[PDB]
């Protein structure tokens, strides 16, 4: 019924503790923001 709720941060996972790397991640736009909303919706549906 319930599946393990996992929210992965694409800011830390892609670039560990790096600001300049994060600047390169911002070049890809919402890919980070979109992948977070997908795992967030999973965590909400598992609660539903």
């Amino acid at each position: 019924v319930s599946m393990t709720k996992t929210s992965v941060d694409c800011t830390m996972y892609i670039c560990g503790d790096s600001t300049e790397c994060s600047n390169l991640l911002l070049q890809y736009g919402s890919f980070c923001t979109q992948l977070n909303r997908a795992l967030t919706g999973i965590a909400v549906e598992q609660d539903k």
């Binding site: 929210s7 941060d9 800011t11 830390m12 503790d17 923001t33 977070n36 967030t40």
Partner: protein
């Protein structure tokens, strides 16, 4: 960065905040100071001698 309420508008890209829980960011504690630990300075080659 003014208020946590305003962080919701910037994450959702909307000036209207609907009722509910929203994750607007992920906090991370930055390092306070740099730690340097190196091996003993002995076992040199005696250039001074």
């Amino acid at each position: 960065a003014l208020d946590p309420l305003s962080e919701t508008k910037c994450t959702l890209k909307s000036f209207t905040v609907e009722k509910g829980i929203y994750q607007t960011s992920n906090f991370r504690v930055q390092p306070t100071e740099s730690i340097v630990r190196f091996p003993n300075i002995t076992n040199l080659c005696p250039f001074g001698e």
